Every structure is written in structure tokens, then in C-alpha cells.
Amino acid sequence: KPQPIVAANWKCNGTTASIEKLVQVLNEHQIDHDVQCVVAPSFVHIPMVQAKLCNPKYAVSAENAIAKSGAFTGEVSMPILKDLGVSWVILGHSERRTYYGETDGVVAQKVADAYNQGFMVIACIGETLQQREANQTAKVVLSQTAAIAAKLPKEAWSQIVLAYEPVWAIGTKVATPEQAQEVHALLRQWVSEKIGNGVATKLRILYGGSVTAGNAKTLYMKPDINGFLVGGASLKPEFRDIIDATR
Amino acid sequence: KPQPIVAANWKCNGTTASIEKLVQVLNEHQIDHDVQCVVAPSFVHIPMVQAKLCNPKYAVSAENAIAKSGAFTGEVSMPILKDLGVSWVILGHSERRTYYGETDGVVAQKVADAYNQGFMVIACIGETLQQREANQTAKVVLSQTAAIAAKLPKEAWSQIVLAYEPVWAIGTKVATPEQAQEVHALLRQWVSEKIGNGVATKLRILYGGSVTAGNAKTLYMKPDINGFLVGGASLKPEFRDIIDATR
Ligand SMILES: [As]
Ligand SMILES: [As]
């Protein structure tokens, strides 16, 4: 397997006091294996996370960005993030595709722009309950991935991480580790066939469903799962156990 | 006139070096009159602005927010901002109404939520070129204002500031000071008639068109203009001259 990644998506949560406490716990956690850890705080919390988080396994990520600076009230741009010293970004999260108008094409352009500006990118894909029940899992996740792929040169993939979000199980159903693996394997096969086998081999495909201390090891044992984009448990000391599972 | 406000909307612009330099200039500027100054930086720049800006006439503002914390990847919430010590927010900026799905009703709810959570709010309204040319200026700006008003108790208005954006002149035509005044007067009259004359008298209605050192004094001389929501010139030392114009 390629190097695992265990990424915290804090979403729109946190107080300066809760962050301070959790970051201290993350700093005190000994990690002895090769793993890239990532924390994505809300934009206003990025500076304090950059200042307080020093565990050398970690990088700080934005949870979203737009490509260009300018007359975009309320948005944050990739050049602004680069200047701030942030080199990771999550793009196409289900919540943005669902609530905030991010179509496959919008996400694909954002990913190409982030690549071109020197970011590591956690590009999120996933099908809804309606899509899964209509037997459209393969078409949807491949369509979302293909949109991204069409805007990227082959060498860009060293900077791309995929995150599979089983949106159908998030706040609805239960996703099993076998169901997760099945999607990861389909994605890997497609990349292998259409992009290249070398690229498919090195590509990190992260599971972005419900990840807990109770299932992390079981999930990471699956041959096509390379770590996690963790939601709720990433706001808790439990995130350390999740990291430990990738040993 | 009520107390003037001169607010900087930095939009999606800035580097840590350019901010540092501009904030030093703002700190060195002597302001001897009663004016509320405001700076709204991009979310990631809020901490460094809170740390470096100390001119006592100023407050820091967010450029947007959502009402609640939770599973809203990439957004920033009002409780998060309150915890961070931010007590001002801009809502309904034209760019958000245009690019980011903020309908009159979305903006109105955001304003009520911000009020209920103890924010000072710069609520933005304005008609497009198409609307102005169809003789719909009054209907549009009143509709946008009425939507907000319908969600607010009478005592909330002490925490509301309106900003008129002549979207029809922004990146298109030229708005004259007489055209600006005409809209501000219409807004004030409506508030006086439908909400109350005491409320109308105390209400700050800011001009959010192109504001420069060359037109600020002329604009502020108009009886219904109570200051400015400044775009481009707010990234420049010129912003001091704009403030000086409200003397
Ligand atoms: As440290
Ligand atoms: As100071």
C-alpha cells in the first residue's frame, strides 16, 4: 500500500478552548509509523492550529477554497492560503456539492486550479441514498472522478488524494467495510485502466464514511483503503486511535 | 445624523505582508471625531487583524457567516465568530446574492440569526443593471429590506446597519452622489413609515458603491448617507481619507 493518510475534517465546529485542548492531545500522541496526518479546521481557526499543532506527522488543510483572489465577498482563495502557509485543501466535500452549488465540473476545475497552485488535494466523491438505491453507485463515483481526471495531467496525481464519502450512509443506513472496499476497488480499477497502473498503485483512496476506534482497523485492513477522512470522531481524542489503526 | 460608519470590505484579497503594512498605516492614522470604523478581512486573516489592528475607532467584522455550527464543510458559523471575539458581520453582499445562492429569504434569516446571537450587522441590499433599467429600483431594494424587516423585532434595529450597493454601477456605469442619495432617502422613508420614525432617524444607511478620496466628502454631505462600505479603496492608505471625509 502507499503511505496512509488520516485526515481530520472539523467541518464548522470548534471553540478556541476546545481546539487548544484537542491539539495538545494530538501533540502528545506518539506516532511511530509512516503516516500523513492532516487537520482541516474552519478558516478562522487555521492560524491558531498552525501555531499550536506541532506533531511532525501533521499538515494543516483548508476545508474549501476558490481559485482566485478578488471580488468574492466571504470566500477564501488558494493564493491567500498559500501565502498563509497552507498547502492542503479539501475540495468537493458532499456538503459543498449538496448545499453550496458544487457540481462535478465546479469541483473538477477547483481541483485543477489547486493542483496548478501547488496544493495537495483531498478530492471528495460519493453517491447519495437515491443514487445507490437506483443502482447508480459506479456511474456516479466514476463520473465525479472522471470530471476531475479530465482536467489533470498524469503527473498531477502525485498531488491528488481521493476520499470516498458514502453519502447514502451519512445521516440516513450503515455502510459495511465490505461495501467500502467494493467502491474503493472499483475506483482503483478505473484509475488503473484509464489513467495508468503506476498511478493507481500509488493513489491514496481514503474512506470518508463513519470512522471510529471500533472500525478503523477493520477498514484499513481492506486492500484498497488507504486511510480516512474523519468527521465526528476527529473532534475527539479518539482520532489518535484511528491514526494508530493505520499501523 | 447618527454616528457615521466607515467599513472596509477587503473581500477575497490580502497577503500577510500587505495586511501588516496597511494595518500599521490604519493604526498611525489619528481620528478625532465620532466614527465607527470596521475592517472585514477574509476569514483566515481575522486572527492577524485582531492581533495587529489596535486603532480604538475600529471593530473587526466577518464578511459572511452561517447561523449554526455543525456539518457544514468550509463554512464559518456565528457561534464560532462570537467565540473568536468577532461581533460584526456583513450579510447579503451582492457577490453572495449573485454567485453563492443568497436569496432575499436566505439573507433575511441570516440577519435575524446574527441579531439573535448579538452581532452588529451590515446588511447589504441593491439592484442590478437589468432591474434599474426596468425601473424596478424601489421595488427591489424595498423588497430586500422588507424581507429582513419581517424577521426582526423593533428593538433589533439598534444592531442593524444597511449598506446600499448600486450593483448596476459596480463593474458595468457611473453612480452619481444624487443617485445614491435618492435611494438612501427612499429607504429611510420606507423605514420611517413601516417600522418607525425613531428607528429611521437612528438607522445608519451606508453607501456601498465606488467610494474614493475624491467623492467621499461629496457623498457624506448627502442627508441620508451615513458612511460607507468601501471596496477597492479600502485595501489602500486612501481608506484614511474616506474616514476623514465623515468629519
Ligand atoms: As509545539
Ligand atoms: As497595537
At B236, which CATH number? 3.20.20.70
Instruction: Select from A7, A21, A88 the least CA-distant residue to A52.
Output: A21
Please list the alpha-helical segments (H only) found in B117-233: 129-133, 137-149, 177-194, 197-202, 216-220
Could you tell me if B172 and B210 are in contact, meaning their C-beta atoms sit under 8 angstroms apart?
A: no
Measured between beta carbons, which residues in chain B are less than 8 angstroms from residue A96?
A: 73-74
Phi, psi of B221 (to 5 degrees): -60, -25
Measured between beta carbons, which residues in chain B are less than 8 angstroms from residue A63?
A: 73-74
Scored b (16 or more CB within 10 A) or e, B21-42 reads ebbeebeebebeeebbbbbbbb
Q: Give the C-alpha separation, A46 to A26, whole Å.
A: 16
Could you tell me if A206 and A122 are in contact, meaning their C-beta atoms sit under 8 angstroms apart?
A: yes
What residue owns the CA closest to ligand 1's atom 1?
A54
Cell of A77: 482563495
Instruction: Select from A154, A63, A137, A146 the least CA-distant residue to A104.
Output: A146
| Nearest Cα residue in chain B from A9 | B73
Number of cross-chain residue pairs from A and B with Cβ atoms under 8 Å apart? 137
Question: Hey, is A165 helix, strand or coil?
Answer: coil
Instruction: Select from A19, A12, A111 the least CA-distant residue to A65.
Output: A111
Measured between beta carbons, which residues in chain A are less than 8 angstroms from residue B64?
A: 73-74
Cell of A4: 496512509
Instruction: Name B5's bridge partners.
Output: B36, B227
Neighbours of B153 (CB within 10 A): 9
Experimental method: X-ray
Phi-psi region of B199 (alpha: psi -120 to 50; beta: other; left: phi over 0): alpha
Quote the number of domains for chain A: 1
Q: Give the C-alpha separation, B138 to B143, whole Å.
A: 8
| Nearest Cα residue in chain B from A62 | B74
Alpha-carbon distance A49 to nearest alpha carbon in chain B (angstroms): 11
Neighbours of A218 (CB within 10 A): 14
Catalytic residue numbers of B?
93, 165
Using a CB–CB cut-off of 8 Å, the residues of B that contact A are 9, 11-16, 42-48, 62-64, 66, 68-77, 80-81, 83-84, 86, 90, 93-96, 99-101, 171, 231
Q: Is B54 in the pocket of ligand 2 (CB under 6 A)?
A: yes
Residue A89, domain extent: 1-247
Burial of B51 (C-beta count, 10 Å sphere; 0-12/13-18/19+): exposed
Neighbours of A128 (CB within 10 A): 20
Which residues, at least 6 apart from B207, have a Cβ–Cβ distance to it below 8 Å? B163, B164, B180, B184, B219, B225, B227, B228, B229
Neighbours of A214 (CB within 10 A): 12
Residues with CB under 6 A from ligand 1: A 27, 54
Could you tell me if A45 and B79 are in contact, meaning their C-beta atoms sit under 8 angstroms apart?
A: no
Resolution (A): 1.9
Neighbours of A23 (CB within 10 A): 21
Strand B204-207 vs strand A160-164: parallel, antiparallel, or unpaired? unpaired
Give distance in angstroms: CA of A110 to centre of ligand 2: 38
Q: Give the C-alpha separation, A216 to A35, whole Å.
A: 14
Alpha-carbon distance A67 to nearest alpha carbon in chain B (angstroms): 11
Could you tell me if A9 and A234 are in contact, meaning their C-beta atoms sit under 8 angstroms apart?
A: yes
Neighbours of A31 (CB within 10 A): 18
Scored b (16 or more CB within 10 A) or e, A137-146 reads beebbbebbe
Cell of A204: 491514496
